[PDB]
Every structure is written in structure tokens, then in C-alpha cells.
CSV table of C-alpha atoms and ligand atoms in Angstrom, one decimal:
chain,number,residue,atom,x,y,z
A,1,UNK,CA,4.5,-3.7,13.3
A,2,UNK,CA,3.3,-5.9,10.4
A,3,UNK,CA,0.6,-3.5,9.2
A,4,UNK,CA,3.2,-0.7,9.0
A,5,UNK,CA,5.8,-3.2,7.4
A,6,UNK,CA,3.4,-4.1,4.6
A,7,UNK,CA,2.9,-0.3,3.9
A,8,UNK,CA,6.6,0.4,3.9
A,9,UNK,CA,7.0,-2.5,1.4
A,10,UNK,CA,4.3,-0.8,-0.8
A,11,UNK,CA,6.3,2.4,-0.6
A,12,UNK,CA,9.6,0.7,-1.4
A,13,UNK,CA,8.4,-1.4,-4.3
A,14,UNK,CA,5.3,0.4,-5.6
A,15,UNK,CA,5.5,4.2,-5.1
A,16,UNK,CA,7.1,7.2,-6.6
A,17,UNK,CA,6.6,11.0,-6.3
A,18,UNK,CA,4.7,12.3,-9.3
A,19,UNK,CA,4.9,16.0,-10.1
A,20,UNK,CA,2.5,17.8,-12.4
A,21,UNK,CA,2.1,21.5,-12.9
A,22,UNK,CA,-0.6,21.3,-10.0
A,23,UNK,CA,1.7,19.8,-7.3
A,24,UNK,CA,3.4,16.6,-6.0
A,25,UNK,CA,1.4,13.4,-5.5
A,26,UNK,CA,2.2,9.9,-4.1
A,27,UNK,CA,2.0,7.7,-7.2
A,28,UNK,CA,1.0,4.1,-6.9
A,29,UNK,CA,2.8,1.8,-9.3
A,30,UNK,CA,0.5,-1.1,-10.1
A,31,UNK,CA,2.4,-3.3,-12.6
A,32,UNK,CA,4.7,-2.9,-15.6
A,33,UNK,CA,5.0,0.9,-16.4
A,34,UNK,CA,1.5,1.8,-15.0
A,35,UNK,CA,1.1,4.3,-12.2
A,36,UNK,CA,-2.2,5.7,-10.7
A,37,UNK,CA,-2.7,9.3,-9.6
A,38,UNK,CA,-5.8,11.3,-8.8
A,39,UNK,CA,-7.4,12.7,-11.9
A,40,UNK,CA,-7.4,16.1,-10.4
A,41,UNK,CA,-3.6,16.0,-10.6
A,42,UNK,CA,-4.1,16.6,-14.4
A,43,UNK,CA,-1.0,15.0,-15.7
A,44,UNK,CA,0.3,16.3,-19.0
A,45,UNK,CA,2.3,14.8,-21.9
A,46,UNK,CA,5.2,14.6,-19.4
A,47,UNK,CA,5.4,14.3,-15.6
A,48,UNK,CA,8.2,14.1,-13.2
A,49,UNK,CA,8.8,10.7,-11.6
A,50,UNK,CA,11.0,11.2,-8.5
A,51,UNK,CA,12.2,14.4,-10.1
A,52,UNK,CA,13.0,12.9,-13.6
A,53,UNK,CA,10.9,14.2,-16.5
A,54,UNK,CA,9.2,11.2,-18.1
A,55,UNK,CA,7.0,11.1,-21.2
A,56,UNK,CA,3.5,9.7,-20.6
A,57,UNK,CA,2.8,7.2,-23.4
A,58,UNK,CA,-0.9,6.6,-22.6
A,59,UNK,CA,-3.3,8.2,-20.0
A,60,UNK,CA,-6.7,7.0,-19.0
A,61,UNK,CA,-9.2,9.0,-16.7
A,62,UNK,CA,-11.6,6.4,-15.4
A,63,UNK,CA,-15.4,6.8,-15.2
A,64,UNK,CA,-18.2,4.5,-14.1
A,65,UNK,CA,-20.8,3.2,-16.6
A,66,UNK,CA,-23.0,6.3,-15.9
A,67,UNK,CA,-20.2,8.7,-16.9
A,68,UNK,CA,-19.3,9.8,-13.4
A,69,UNK,CA,-15.6,10.3,-12.7
A,70,UNK,CA,-13.9,7.9,-10.4
A,71,UNK,CA,-10.8,10.2,-9.7
A,72,UNK,CA,-8.4,7.4,-10.8
A,73,UNK,CA,-6.1,8.3,-13.7
A,74,UNK,CA,-3.8,5.5,-15.1
A,75,UNK,CA,-0.6,6.5,-16.8
A,76,UNK,CA,1.7,4.3,-18.8
A,77,UNK,CA,5.2,5.7,-18.4
A,78,UNK,CA,8.2,5.8,-20.8
A,79,UNK,CA,10.9,4.2,-18.7
A,80,UNK,CA,12.8,1.0,-18.1
A,81,UNK,CA,11.7,0.1,-14.6
A,82,UNK,CA,8.8,-2.3,-14.1
A,83,UNK,CA,6.8,-2.1,-10.9
A,84,UNK,CA,6.3,-5.2,-8.8
A,85,UNK,CA,2.9,-6.5,-9.8
A,86,UNK,CA,0.4,-5.8,-7.0
A,87,UNK,CA,-2.8,-6.6,-8.9
A,88,UNK,CA,-3.3,-9.7,-6.6
A,89,UNK,CA,-3.9,-7.2,-3.7
A,90,UNK,CA,-6.6,-5.2,-5.4
A,91,UNK,CA,-10.2,-6.1,-4.4
A,92,UNK,CA,-12.6,-7.4,-7.0
A,93,UNK,CA,-15.6,-5.6,-5.4
A,94,UNK,CA,-16.7,-2.5,-3.4
A,95,UNK,CA,-16.7,-3.2,0.3
A,96,UNK,CA,-16.1,-1.6,3.8
A,97,UNK,CA,-12.8,-2.3,5.6
A,98,UNK,CA,-11.9,-2.0,9.3
A,99,UNK,CA,-8.7,-0.5,10.6
A,100,UNK,CA,-7.1,0.9,7.4
A,101,UNK,CA,-3.8,2.7,6.9
A,102,UNK,CA,-2.6,5.4,4.4
A,103,UNK,CA,1.0,5.1,3.1
A,104,UNK,CA,2.4,8.5,2.2
A,105,UNK,CA,5.5,9.5,0.2
A,106,UNK,CA,5.1,12.9,-1.4
A,107,UNK,CA,5.2,16.2,0.5
A,108,UNK,CA,7.0,14.9,3.6
A,109,UNK,CA,10.7,14.2,4.4
A,110,UNK,CA,10.3,10.4,4.8
A,111,UNK,CA,7.7,7.9,3.9
A,112,UNK,CA,5.1,7.3,6.8
A,113,UNK,CA,2.0,5.3,7.6
A,114,UNK,CA,-1.1,6.8,9.1
A,115,UNK,CA,-3.8,4.8,10.6
A,116,UNK,CA,-7.1,6.3,9.4
A,117,UNK,CA,-9.4,3.8,11.2
A,118,UNK,CA,-12.5,2.1,9.7
A,119,UNK,CA,-13.3,2.8,6.1
A,120,UNK,CA,-16.7,2.7,4.4
A,121,UNK,CA,-17.8,2.4,0.8
A,122,UNK,CA,-19.5,5.9,0.8
A,123,UNK,CA,-21.0,6.2,-2.7
A,124,UNK,CA,-20.9,9.5,-4.6
A,125,UNK,CA,-19.7,12.9,-3.3
A,126,UNK,CA,-19.4,16.4,-4.7
A,127,UNK,CA,-15.6,17.1,-4.9
A,128,UNK,CA,-15.2,20.8,-5.5
A,129,UNK,CA,-18.8,20.8,-6.9
A,130,UNK,CA,-18.2,17.8,-9.3
A,131,UNK,CA,-19.9,14.4,-8.7
A,132,UNK,CA,-17.3,11.7,-8.0
A,133,UNK,CA,-18.2,8.0,-7.7
A,134,UNK,CA,-16.9,5.0,-5.6
A,135,UNK,CA,-15.5,6.9,-2.7
A,136,UNK,CA,-14.0,5.2,0.3
A,137,UNK,CA,-14.5,7.4,3.4
A,138,UNK,CA,-12.6,7.6,6.7
A,139,UNK,CA,-12.9,9.8,9.8
A,140,UNK,CA,-9.4,11.4,9.6
A,141,UNK,CA,-8.5,15.0,9.1
A,142,UNK,CA,-6.4,14.4,6.0
A,143,UNK,CA,-4.7,17.5,4.5
A,144,UNK,CA,-3.2,18.9,1.4
A,145,UNK,CA,-0.1,16.9,0.6
A,146,UNK,CA,-1.8,13.5,1.3
A,147,UNK,CA,-3.1,13.0,-2.3
A,148,UNK,CA,-2.2,9.7,-3.9
A,149,UNK,CA,-1.6,8.2,-0.5
A,150,UNK,CA,-2.2,4.5,-0.7
A,151,UNK,CA,-5.1,3.2,1.4
A,152,UNK,CA,-4.4,-0.4,2.4
A,153,UNK,CA,-4.5,-3.3,4.8
A,154,UNK,CA,-2.1,-6.3,4.9
A,155,UNK,CA,-2.6,-8.0,1.5
A,156,UNK,CA,-5.2,-5.4,0.4
A,157,UNK,CA,-4.5,-2.3,-1.7
A,158,UNK,CA,-7.8,-0.4,-1.5
A,159,UNK,CA,-7.6,3.0,-3.0
A,160,UNK,CA,-5.7,6.3,-3.4
A,161,UNK,CA,-6.3,9.4,-1.4
A,162,UNK,CA,-8.1,12.2,-3.3
A,163,UNK,CA,-9.9,14.6,-1.0
A,164,UNK,CA,-11.1,15.8,2.4
A,165,UNK,CA,-12.9,18.5,4.2
A,166,UNK,CA,-11.0,18.8,7.5
A,167,UNK,CA,-13.2,16.1,9.3
A,168,UNK,CA,-13.3,13.2,6.8
A,169,UNK,CA,-10.9,11.8,4.1
A,170,UNK,CA,-11.8,10.2,0.8
A,171,UNK,CA,-10.0,7.7,-1.4
A,172,UNK,CA,-10.8,6.7,-5.0
A,173,UNK,CA,-11.5,3.0,-5.0
A,174,UNK,CA,-9.2,0.5,-6.8
A,175,UNK,CA,-10.9,-2.5,-8.3
A,176,UNK,CA,-9.1,-5.4,-10.0
A,177,UNK,CA,-11.1,-5.0,-13.2
A,178,UNK,CA,-9.5,-1.5,-13.8
A,179,UNK,CA,-6.5,-3.6,-15.1
A,180,UNK,CA,-6.2,-6.7,-17.4
B,201,6OY,C1,-4.8,16.5,-2.3
B,201,6OY,C2,-4.3,17.4,-3.4
B,201,6OY,C3,-3.6,18.6,-2.8
B,201,6OY,O1,-3.0,18.6,-1.8
B,201,6OY,O2,-3.7,19.7,-3.6
B,201,6OY,C4,-2.6,20.7,-3.5
B,201,6OY,C5,-3.0,21.7,-2.4
B,201,6OY,C6,-6.0,17.1,-1.5
B,201,6OY,C7,-6.2,16.5,-0.1
B,201,6OY,C8,-7.4,17.2,0.6
B,201,6OY,C9,-7.2,18.7,0.9
B,201,6OY,C10,-8.0,19.0,2.2
B,201,6OY,N1,-7.9,17.6,2.8
B,201,6OY,C11,-7.6,16.6,2.0
B,201,6OY,O3,-7.6,15.4,2.3
B,201,6OY,N2,-7.2,17.0,-2.3
B,201,6OY,C12,-7.9,18.1,-2.7
B,201,6OY,O4,-7.6,19.3,-2.4
B,201,6OY,C13,-9.1,17.7,-3.6
B,201,6OY,C14,-8.9,18.1,-5.1
B,201,6OY,C15,-9.4,19.5,-5.2
B,201,6OY,C16,-9.6,19.8,-6.7
B,201,6OY,C17,-8.6,20.6,-7.3
B,201,6OY,C18,-8.8,20.9,-8.7
B,201,6OY,C19,-9.8,20.4,-9.4
B,201,6OY,C20,-10.7,19.5,-8.8
B,201,6OY,C21,-10.6,19.3,-7.4
B,201,6OY,C22,-10.6,19.5,-4.3
B,201,6OY,N3,-10.3,18.6,-3.2
B,201,6OY,C23,-10.8,18.5,-2.0
B,201,6OY,O5,-10.4,17.7,-1.2
B,201,6OY,C24,-12.0,19.4,-1.7
B,201,6OY,N4,-12.9,18.8,-0.8
B,201,6OY,C25,-14.1,18.5,-1.1
B,201,6OY,O6,-14.7,18.9,-2.1
B,201,6OY,C26,-14.9,17.6,-0.2
B,201,6OY,C27,-16.2,17.1,-0.3
B,201,6OY,C28,-16.3,16.3,0.7
B,201,6OY,C29,-17.5,15.4,1.2
B,201,6OY,O7,-15.2,16.1,1.4
B,201,6OY,N5,-14.2,17.0,0.8
B,201,6OY,C30,-11.5,20.8,-1.2
B,201,6OY,C31,-10.7,20.7,0.1
B,201,6OY,C32,-12.6,21.8,-1.1
């Protein structure tokens, strides 16, 4: 009940469907007009937010200090609405987390919560041949359509779903220092 309730509140207050030319993604609204999507979504000068074409004012693809992509892209949107500020839920450090959930919005008829089990700080992987850092891994057969899904626990917004191989699933980590 409560684990699913927290996820449904994240969907209600902090999600949107983002469409780029490469597909539909669950977009996590962090605060003000800032949303995160996987970098591989390759957002352009405009995106659709719940079907409405919206100009992107600023876009940041995040990399670690060694220049390895994190697969987090932050977009500042040209619109009125401000997202509920969920920066207080974002961890300061990399860690492992037991019994996590993924909150999904895009590519399905209604928002749903999937329990993905225990999550580990997995390090770097090769995502379609390109090194990607700070992955959070779970043993769940995530599929196309899950990207952007919000990995969370009650009071903890941990990452966004970016990839998988039919056995395991991977989220890009969210760290508090990615925002001021
Ligand atoms: C979300 C995006 C999506 O649905 O794309 C529209 C079809 C995908 C979720 C994945 C798909 C399979 N299961 C999932 O959880 N994510 C992807 O498809 C990502 C992004 C692409 C990509 C596209 C363009 C440019 C760069 C990258 C690659 N990819 C992957 O998940 C891959 N998986 C891996 O490389 C991999 C490595 C390891 C350890 O685990 N998975 C592809 C499925 C090959």
C-alpha cells in the first residue's frame, strides 16, 4: 500500500510523458521547470510534454569527472507550471537499496508501479557499446517502453530507467549535487 502510494504521488505531482523524435519517455519533474530524461532520448529544441509542443530553454547532458556519460539529461522547459520540489528525496551519495520500485507513466494506458527488487550500485556498463557510468542495477526483465521510469523507495528518488538486456534492468543514478 504505502510504497505504491508514494510512487503514485510521484506520478501525480512529478511526472509527464516526454516525446522526442525517438519515442515516448516517462519524464521526472525535479523542481521548477526542470525535467530529467535519459540522454539517449536525444531531446531537441522542442519536445512534447503530455502531447503539447514545448520549447526547451536549456539542456544539459551529464557526465562524470572522467567524461563518461551518466545518461541523465536535464531540460529546463518553457512553460508556466512548476513541479513540486522533490530534491529533498534525492540521495547525496551512491549506495545500494533493497526492495525498490519503478513508477511508469509513458507507453501504457495508466500509471503503474513495478517492484524490481533489490538494487545495487553497479558501476559502469557498455550501453549499446558506449560506456555509461553510475548505473543502478536490478534483476527484472524491463522492456522497451519503461525508459524514464522512476526508481524509488518511500522518501527516496533514486534514478531513472535507461536500459536492460532481458534479464537485468539499469537506471541512471540521481544525486542531489546534480541540482543547486
Ligand atoms: C528504453 C528506451 C526504449 O524503449 O526505446 C524505444 C524502443 C529502453 C529500455 C530497455 C530496452 C530493453 N530493456 C530495457 O529495459 N532502453 C534502451 O533501449 C537503451 C537505449 C538504447 C540506445 C538507443 C540509441 C542510442 C543509444 C542507446 C540501448 N538501450 C539498451 O537498453 C540496450 N541494452 C544494453 O546495451 C545493455 C547492456 C547491459 C549490461 O544491459 N543492457 C539495448 C537493449 C541493446
